[PDB]
mmCIF file of C-alpha atoms and ligand atoms in Angstrom:
data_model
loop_
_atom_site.group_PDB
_atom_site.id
_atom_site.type_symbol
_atom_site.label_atom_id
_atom_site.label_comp_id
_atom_site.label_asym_id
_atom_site.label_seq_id
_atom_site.Cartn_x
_atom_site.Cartn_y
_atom_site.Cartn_z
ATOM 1 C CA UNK A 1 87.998 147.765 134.240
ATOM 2 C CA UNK A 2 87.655 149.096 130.646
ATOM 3 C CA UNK A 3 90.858 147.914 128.806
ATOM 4 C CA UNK A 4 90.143 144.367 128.750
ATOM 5 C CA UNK A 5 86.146 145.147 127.766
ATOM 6 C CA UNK A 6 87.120 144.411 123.560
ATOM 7 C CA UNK A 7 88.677 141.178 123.966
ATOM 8 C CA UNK A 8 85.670 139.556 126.473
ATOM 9 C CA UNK A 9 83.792 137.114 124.731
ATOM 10 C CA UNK A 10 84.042 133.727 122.758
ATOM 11 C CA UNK A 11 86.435 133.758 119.676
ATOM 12 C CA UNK A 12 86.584 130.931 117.004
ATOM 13 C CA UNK A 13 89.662 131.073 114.782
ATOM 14 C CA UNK A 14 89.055 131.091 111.157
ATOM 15 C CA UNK A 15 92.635 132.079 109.574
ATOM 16 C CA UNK A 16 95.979 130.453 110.499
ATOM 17 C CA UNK A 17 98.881 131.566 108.518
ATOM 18 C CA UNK A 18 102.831 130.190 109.605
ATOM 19 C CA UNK A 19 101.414 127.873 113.044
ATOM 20 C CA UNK A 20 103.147 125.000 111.602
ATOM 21 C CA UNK A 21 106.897 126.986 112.139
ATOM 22 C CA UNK A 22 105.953 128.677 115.147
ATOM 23 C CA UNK A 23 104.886 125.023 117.037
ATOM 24 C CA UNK A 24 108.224 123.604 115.194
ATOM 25 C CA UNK A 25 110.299 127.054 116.762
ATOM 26 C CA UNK A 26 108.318 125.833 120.466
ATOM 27 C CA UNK A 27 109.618 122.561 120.455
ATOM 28 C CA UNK A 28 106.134 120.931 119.902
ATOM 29 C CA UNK A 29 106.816 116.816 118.983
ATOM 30 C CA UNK A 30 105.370 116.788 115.329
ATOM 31 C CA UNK A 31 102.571 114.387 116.120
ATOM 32 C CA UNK A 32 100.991 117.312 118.303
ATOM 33 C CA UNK A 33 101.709 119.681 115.668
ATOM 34 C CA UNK A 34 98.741 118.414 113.140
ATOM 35 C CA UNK A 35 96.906 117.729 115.973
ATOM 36 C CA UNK A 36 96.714 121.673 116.436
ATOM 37 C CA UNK A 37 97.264 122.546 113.022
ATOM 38 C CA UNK A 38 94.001 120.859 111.487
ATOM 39 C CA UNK A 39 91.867 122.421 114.391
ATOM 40 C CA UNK A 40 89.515 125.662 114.964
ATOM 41 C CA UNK A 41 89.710 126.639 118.486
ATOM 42 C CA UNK A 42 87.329 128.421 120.192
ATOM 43 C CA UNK A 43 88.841 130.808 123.110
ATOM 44 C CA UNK A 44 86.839 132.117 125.822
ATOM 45 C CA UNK A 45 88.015 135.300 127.622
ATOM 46 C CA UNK A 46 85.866 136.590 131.001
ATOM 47 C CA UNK A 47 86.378 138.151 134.002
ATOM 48 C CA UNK A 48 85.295 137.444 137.364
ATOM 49 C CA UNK A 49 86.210 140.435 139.480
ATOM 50 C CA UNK A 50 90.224 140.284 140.102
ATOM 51 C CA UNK A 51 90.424 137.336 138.265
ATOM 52 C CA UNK A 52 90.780 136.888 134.165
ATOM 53 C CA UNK A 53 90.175 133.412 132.739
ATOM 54 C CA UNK A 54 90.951 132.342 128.799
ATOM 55 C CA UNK A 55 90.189 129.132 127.684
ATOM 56 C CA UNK A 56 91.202 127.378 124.294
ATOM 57 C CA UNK A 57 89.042 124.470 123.637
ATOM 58 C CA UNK A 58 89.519 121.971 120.619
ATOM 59 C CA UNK A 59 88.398 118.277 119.040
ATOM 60 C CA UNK A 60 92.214 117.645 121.006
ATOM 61 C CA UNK A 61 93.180 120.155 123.743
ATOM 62 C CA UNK A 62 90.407 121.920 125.976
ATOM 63 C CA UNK A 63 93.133 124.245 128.159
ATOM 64 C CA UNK A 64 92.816 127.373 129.909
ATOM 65 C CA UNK A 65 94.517 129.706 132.379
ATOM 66 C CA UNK A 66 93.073 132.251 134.903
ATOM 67 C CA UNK A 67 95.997 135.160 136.238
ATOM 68 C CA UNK A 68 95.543 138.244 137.392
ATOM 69 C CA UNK A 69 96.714 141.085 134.936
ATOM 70 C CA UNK A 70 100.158 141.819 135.471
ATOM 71 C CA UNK A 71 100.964 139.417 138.034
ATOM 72 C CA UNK A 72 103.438 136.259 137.054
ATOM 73 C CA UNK A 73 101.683 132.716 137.209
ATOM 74 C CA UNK A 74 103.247 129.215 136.873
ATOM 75 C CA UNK A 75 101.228 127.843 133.312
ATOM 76 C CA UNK A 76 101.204 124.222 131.846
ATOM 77 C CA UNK A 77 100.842 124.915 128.186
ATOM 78 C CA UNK A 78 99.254 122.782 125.838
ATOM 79 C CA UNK A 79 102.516 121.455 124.616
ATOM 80 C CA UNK A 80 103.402 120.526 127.950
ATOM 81 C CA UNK A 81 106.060 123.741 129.023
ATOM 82 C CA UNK A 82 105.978 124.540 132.754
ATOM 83 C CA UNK A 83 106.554 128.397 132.046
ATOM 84 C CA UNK A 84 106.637 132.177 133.795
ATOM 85 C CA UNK A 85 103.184 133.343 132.463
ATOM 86 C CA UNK A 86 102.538 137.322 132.927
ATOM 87 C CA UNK A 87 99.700 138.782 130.517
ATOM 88 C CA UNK A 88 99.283 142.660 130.386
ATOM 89 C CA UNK A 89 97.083 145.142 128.114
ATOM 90 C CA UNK A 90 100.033 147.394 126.353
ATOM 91 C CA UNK A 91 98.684 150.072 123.438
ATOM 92 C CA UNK A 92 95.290 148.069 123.147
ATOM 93 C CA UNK A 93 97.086 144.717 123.023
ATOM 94 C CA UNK A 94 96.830 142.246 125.162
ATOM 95 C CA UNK A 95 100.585 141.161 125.744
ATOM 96 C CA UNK A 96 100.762 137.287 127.155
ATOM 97 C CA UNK A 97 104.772 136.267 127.554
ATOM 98 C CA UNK A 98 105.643 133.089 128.642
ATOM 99 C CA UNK A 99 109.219 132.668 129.682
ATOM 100 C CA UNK A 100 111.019 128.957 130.425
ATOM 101 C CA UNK A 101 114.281 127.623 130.012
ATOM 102 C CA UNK A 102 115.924 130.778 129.782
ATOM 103 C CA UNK A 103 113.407 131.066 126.900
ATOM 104 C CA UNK A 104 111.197 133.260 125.963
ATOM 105 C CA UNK A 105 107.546 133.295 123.307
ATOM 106 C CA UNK A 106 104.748 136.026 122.896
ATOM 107 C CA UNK A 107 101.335 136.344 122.128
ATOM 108 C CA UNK A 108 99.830 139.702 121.414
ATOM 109 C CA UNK A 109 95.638 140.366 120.922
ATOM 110 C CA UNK A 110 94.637 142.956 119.618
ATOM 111 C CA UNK A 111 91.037 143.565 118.090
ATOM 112 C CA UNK A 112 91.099 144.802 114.948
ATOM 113 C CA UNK A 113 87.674 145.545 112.708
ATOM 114 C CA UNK A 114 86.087 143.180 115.467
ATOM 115 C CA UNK A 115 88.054 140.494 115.032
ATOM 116 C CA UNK A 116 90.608 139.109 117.181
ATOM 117 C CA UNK A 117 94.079 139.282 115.427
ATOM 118 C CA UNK A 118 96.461 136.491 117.457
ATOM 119 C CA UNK A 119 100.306 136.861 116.508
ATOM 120 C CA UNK A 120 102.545 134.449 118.250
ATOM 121 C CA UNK A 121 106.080 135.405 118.207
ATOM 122 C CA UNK A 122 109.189 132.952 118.840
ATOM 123 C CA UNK A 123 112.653 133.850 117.858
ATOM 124 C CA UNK A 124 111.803 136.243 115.066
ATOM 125 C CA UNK A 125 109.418 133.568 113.401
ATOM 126 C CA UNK A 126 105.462 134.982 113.659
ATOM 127 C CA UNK A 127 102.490 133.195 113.229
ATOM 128 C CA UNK A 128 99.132 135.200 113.022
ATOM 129 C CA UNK A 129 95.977 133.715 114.256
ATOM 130 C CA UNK A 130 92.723 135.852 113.463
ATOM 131 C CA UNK A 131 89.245 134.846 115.436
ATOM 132 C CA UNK A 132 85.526 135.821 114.826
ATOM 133 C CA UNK A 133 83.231 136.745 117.578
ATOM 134 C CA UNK A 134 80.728 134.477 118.313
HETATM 135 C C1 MYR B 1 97.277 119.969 122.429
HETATM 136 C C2 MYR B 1 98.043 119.880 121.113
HETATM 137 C C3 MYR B 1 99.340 120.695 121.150
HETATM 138 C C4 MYR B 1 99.208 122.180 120.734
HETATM 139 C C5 MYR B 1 100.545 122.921 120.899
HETATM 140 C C6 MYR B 1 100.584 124.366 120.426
HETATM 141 C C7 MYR B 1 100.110 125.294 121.531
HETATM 142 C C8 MYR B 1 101.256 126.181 121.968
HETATM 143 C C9 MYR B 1 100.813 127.640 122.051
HETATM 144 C C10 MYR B 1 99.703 127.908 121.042
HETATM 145 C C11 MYR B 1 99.129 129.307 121.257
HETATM 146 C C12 MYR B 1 98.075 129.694 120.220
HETATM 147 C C13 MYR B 1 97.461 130.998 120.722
HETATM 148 C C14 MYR B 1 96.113 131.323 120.106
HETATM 149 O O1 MYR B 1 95.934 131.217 118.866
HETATM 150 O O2 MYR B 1 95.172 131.736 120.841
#
């Protein structure tokens, strides 16, 4: 497995541009949006043979999702959607769509200049999350 190697490690964000529109596109109740809009998450992305594991942790939330590449899995997201989770690597991005409700968001990863560039993509509004290796 070498097309997942760039994105394994621990990632704390340090640039947030457009999250507020994206949560308010989700649906997220605007209590929970400055709960995750005054935050730095740290995500963790490993591997444990088949298995892939990423995990956002925060003052708030501390989530996290395991899946095999490629393969749909049922996801609780932090915002409380029961979705259709299926996360593949596409042109050196990893592609994560989450589909509910007739519904559908995505977040692409891609590393760019070693950092992790984030953008989250609802209904033609885009937020873009970038994250520094720890
Ligand atoms: C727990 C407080 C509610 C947070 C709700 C917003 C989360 C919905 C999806 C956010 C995805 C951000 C992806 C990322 O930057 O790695």
């Amino acid at each position: 497995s070498h097309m997942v190697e760039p994105f394994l490690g621990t990632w704390k964000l340090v640039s947030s541009e457009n999250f507020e529109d994206y949560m308010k596109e989700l649906g997220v109740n605007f209590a929970a949006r400055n709960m995750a809009g005054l935050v730095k998450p740290t995500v963790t992305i490993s591997v444990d043979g088949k298995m892939m594991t990423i995990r956002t942790e925060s003052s708030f939330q501390d989530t996290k999702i395991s899946f095999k590449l490629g393969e749909e899995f049922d996801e609780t997201t932090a915002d409380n959607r029961k979705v259709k989770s299926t996360i593949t690597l596409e042109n050196g991005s990893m592609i994560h769509v989450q589909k509910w409700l007739g519904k559908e968001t995505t977040i692409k990863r891609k590393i760019v200049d070693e950092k992790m560039v984030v953008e989250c993509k609802m209904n033609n509004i885009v937020s873009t999350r970038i994250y520094e290796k720890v």
